[PDB]
């Protein structure tokens with residue numbers, strides 16, 4: 001119980017569900033969840049993590065880094081705890097980019113995401129968060145919020161010519 | 172035993188050329204290399220593009236196979252320049268893996284019953300009917316010859332994941 005929480009891998013039914021909202025903030029259980037997620041994400045050099053990825057079906061995501069080894073060309077993204085999120089695209093403009101996932105180890109695929117979003121949610125103390133994001137920041141937020149509705153990035157790919165093993169695509 | 176290319180390599184996305192000349196030392200050597208590679212990886216089938224050779228050559232078949240432990244014996248076959256004709260449009264879903272997609276399984280709809288036509292490495296005709304897993308592996312291997320891996324054929328990506336998660340008794 002004191003060991004780092006394991007990341008569930010694609011195929012597990014818990015990655016395919018609708019997460020429930022957090023109803024009570026600033027609780028010992030929620031602080032422990034956030035702590036567990038950061039420890040799990042940092043240990044795996046993740047860019048983000050969603051609670052369903054450690055088997056917790058709650059609307060909690062974390063993301064952010066300065067320099068990240070799995071995505072070495074990505075700019076810094078502010079470290080964030082985002083609970084009960086809503087995403088609103090500012091326009092319908094999209095961009096294709098390469099995504100991975102700690103629940104899909106070893107692979108990358110090209111996924112289109114909105115270029116410009118606003119997002120809203122709360123931190124673990126219940127304080128509102130309201131932000132605008134573009135580019136990779138916007139991409140990570142969309143990827144993580146997808147986990148909360150049971151979506152993994154291969155479900156967003158239409159052209160699987162742009163999908164394969166990281167070591168082959170990025171040697 | 173030659174290296175099996177992994178998904179992401181552009182050579183797996185090519186449309187393969189037909190074999191022009193049969194019973195040549197070059198073709199026999201290719202077939203031998205494919206069998207060694209396939210058996211060393213416990214493969215159910217293998218296509219020439221998976222070892223980097225852009226030719227319409229596939230092999231398949233076994234008595235028992237550990238990666239598909241429920242599958243019945245499939246005739247050990249060399250199939251060159253193949254064509255597939257469905258007997259009907261009846262489709263069925265089944266779990267597929269691939270040596271070029273190591274570690275994963277996905278549910279893929281295939282024709283339940285097919286006729287298939289081709290040649291062995293000596294140029295003798297092959298004209299068969301197949302159902303079930305035999306028909307599935309023939310469709311899977313012939314897909315490699317037109318640059319297709321099974322993720323291109325999956326309709327429901329909730330039925331795609333790592334083998335040991337989907338099948339923990341493996």
Ligand SMILES: [Fe+2]
Pocket residue numbers: 100101102103143144147
């Ligand atoms: Fe993810």
Ligand SMILES: [Fe+2]
Pocket residue numbers: 268269270271311312315
């Ligand atoms: Fe294959």
